[PDB]
C-alpha cells in the first residue's frame, strides 16, 4: 500500500468532524482540540489559527478528546494518546479489546471508559510527574449499577470521586480505593449528555427527551429541570463569565440559551450546524469569557459571543442575542472536484456536493 | 444533609504545601498536613472563591388553578404558531405557494 514517489503530508481542508472537541487554557488564553478521523487539530480560540496537528495518523479513528493545560489526550480504538504539542509522548493501550468510549482527567488520575461498560484508571507515577502513566485499575459498571456509559466527568471539590453517568443513572467512585461510594437512582429518560457546573455539586444532564436536569450529589437530588419540545440534546455548557447562563445544543443543529435565574430562554440559535451531519455536535463556553465555541459535523467550527448588555439600569434582564464571530469551515460533503489554483502552490480550489467552492 | 458518607475520605491525609496553588487553602502558616474533611471544606470554599453561587441553585427548586400555568407552557414551546396543525383552513396574508 506504500507509495515510493509520494507520501502523505496532511489532509488539507478539515476543521472538525463531529467528535466532541476539548477546550484547554494556556495561562489566560484558550485552545481548541478537534478531531478529523485519525488526526487531531489544535487552534487558538482568539483567531482560529491552526496551532498543531498530530505527528502521526493514528491507526484507527480517534474516539475521544480531552485536554489539560499542556497535554491533549486523544483516545482511539484500544489505546489513548498523551500528546504534548501534537506529538505522541505516551501511548496508553488499555487491557481489553473493547473500544474507548469516553475519558476524563482529574487529580493524579486519568479515567477512560470503554464499551464493555468498564472504566480504566491510570495514575501518575508521581504527583511530581505531570502525565499519567501508572496503570491503577479497571472498575466496571454492571447492569444493576448502570447502563451504557455516556460520560465520565469529575465535578470539582470531590476528592478522588469519579462521576460516571450512563443512559440510566449516575455513579460515584473512590478511584484510590475502587469502591462505588454512591449510586444515583435511574432517571426515567435516556440520558445523552453530561456537563459539570460552576456551581458546586451539580451535573447537568440532557436526555434523549428535550430535558436538562441539574443534579446534586451531596443531595443526590435533581434540583431543577428544563424542558425542550421535541429535540434531542447533544451538548451542554455553562457560561461562567459573570451571569449564570446555560447552553443546550441539540442534534437538530440548534443552540438554546437559558438564564436559570430568570428561568427563561434567552435566544435559540437555529441551524448553526447541519442537522444531517449530527446537528450541533459540541458547543462549549470558554471559561470566564462571554464566548461560546460551537462545532458541527459539517466540517465547521464557529464562534459566537454574547454582546454585553445594553441595559445600563438592568443589565441581566435585557440580553443581546448571540452573534456570529470567527469560524473555520470545511466542505460538509466530500469534495467532488479540486484543482490547483495559483502558480506558486499557494491556493487550491475545492468544490463539493456541499454545493460550494472553497 | 449529605446523602452519601464517604467513610474512606476522612482517613486520608493530604500534605498541602507541596502544591504551589493550594497555598490559599492553609488557614494558618502552621498547618501543612490536613485530614480529608477539613481539606475538602477548604476546597469547597475555594471553588466558592472562583465562581460565586448564582441565585437559581441555592433558592430556585422544583422538588385550584396555578398562576404559573401560562409561563410553563410558554417555556416548553419554541414555535408558538401551530405549524403542526395541518388545520385544513387557510391562513391569511401568507401563501405557502411554490412555482413549479
Amino acid at each position: 500500500k506504500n507509495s515510493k514517489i509520494f507520501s502523505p503530508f496532511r489532509i488539507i481542508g478539515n476543521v472538525s468532524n463531529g467528535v466532541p472537541f476539548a477546550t484547554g487554557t494556556l495561562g489566560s488564553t484558550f485552545y481548541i482540540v478537534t478531531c478529523v478521523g485519525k488526526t487531531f487539530q489544535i487552534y487558538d480560540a482568539n483567531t482560529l489559527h491552526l496551532l498543531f496537528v498530530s505527528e502521526k495518523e493514528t491507526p484507527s479513528s480517534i474516539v475521544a478528546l480531552s485536554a489539560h493545560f499542556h497535554y491533549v489526550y486523544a483516545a482511539y480504538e484500544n489505546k489513548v494518546g498523551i500528546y504534548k504539542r501534537g506529538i505522541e509522548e505516551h501511548l496508553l493501550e488499555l487491557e481489553t479489546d473493547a473500544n474507548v468510549e469516553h475519558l476524563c482527567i482529574f487529580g493524579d488520575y486519568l479515567c477512560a471508559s470503554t464499551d464493555d461498560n468498564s472504566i480504566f484508571i491510570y495514575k501518575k507515577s508521581d504527583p511530581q510527574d505531570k502525565y499519567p502513566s501508572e496503570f491503577y485499575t479497571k472498575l466496571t459498571v454492571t447492569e444493576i449499577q448502570g447502563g451504557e456509559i455516556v460520560s465520565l466527568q469529575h465535578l470539582a471539590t470531590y476528592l478522588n470521586k469519579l462521576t460516571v453517568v450512563t443512559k440510566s443513572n449516575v455513579l460515584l467512585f473512590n478511584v484510590r480505593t475502587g469502591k462505588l461510594v454512591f449510586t444515583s437512582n435511574e432517571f426515567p429518560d435516556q440520558i445523552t449528555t453530561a456537563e459539570p457546573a460552576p456551581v458546586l455539586d451539580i451535573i447537568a444532564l440532557g436526555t434523549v427527551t428535550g430535558e436538562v436536569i441539574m443534579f446534586n450529589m451531596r443531595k443526590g437530588k435533581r434540583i431543577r429541570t428544563i424542558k425542550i419540545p421535541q429535540s434531542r440534546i447533544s451538548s451542554l455548557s455553562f457560561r461562567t463569565d459573570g451571569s449564570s447562563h446555560l447552553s443546550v445544543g441539540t442534534s437538530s443543529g440548534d443552540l438554546i440559551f437559558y438564564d436559570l435565574d430568570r428561568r427563561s430562554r434567552i435566544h435559540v440559535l437555529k441551524n448553526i450546524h447541519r442537522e444531517s451531519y449530527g446537528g450541533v455536535t459540541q458547543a462549549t463556553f470558554l471559561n470566564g469569557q462571554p464566548i461560546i465555541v460551537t462545532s458541527g459535523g459539517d466540517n465547521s467550527l464557529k464562534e459566537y459571543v454574547f454582546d454585553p448588555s445594553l441595559s445600563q439600569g438592568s443589565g441581566d434582564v435585557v440580553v443581546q442575542p448571540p452573534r456570529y464571530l470567527r469560524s473555520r469551515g470545511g466542505h460538509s460533503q466530500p469534495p467532488s472536484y479540486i484543482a490547483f489554483a495559483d502558480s506558486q502552490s499557494h491556493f487550491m480550489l475545492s468544490a463539493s456536493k456541499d454545493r460550494s467552492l472553497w | 444533609e449529605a446523602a452519601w458518607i464517604d467513610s474512606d475520605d476522612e482517613k486520608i491525609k493530604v500534605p498541602i504545601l507541596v502544591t504551589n496553588k493550594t497555598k490559599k487553602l492553609r488557614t494558618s502558616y502552621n498547618e501543612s498536613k490536613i485530614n480529608g474533611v477539613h481539606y475538602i471544606n477548604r476546597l469547597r470554599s475555594q471553588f466558592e472563591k472562583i465562581y460565586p453561587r448564582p441565585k437559581w441553585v441555592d433558592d430556585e427548586s422544583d422538588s385550584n388553578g396555578d398562576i404559573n400555568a401560562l409561563t410553563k407552557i410558554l417555556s416548553t414551546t419554541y414555535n408558538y404558531k401551530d405549524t403542526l396543525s395541518n388545520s385544513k383552513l387557510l391562513p391569511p396574508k401568507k401563501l405557502d405557494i411554490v412555482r413549479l
Partner: peptide
C-alpha cells in the same frame, strides 16, 4: 437602536484545577 457589534477582547478568569484532587497513601 444602534445594534452594532463591539470589539470583544478575551479577558482572563480562573477555573478549578482538577489536577489538585488526589491524596496519596496512608
Amino acid at each position: 437602536v444602534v445594534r452594532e457589534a463591539k470589539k470583544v477582547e478575551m479577558t482572563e478568569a480562573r477555573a478549578y484545577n482538577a489536577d489538585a484532587d488526589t491524596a496519596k497513601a496512608a
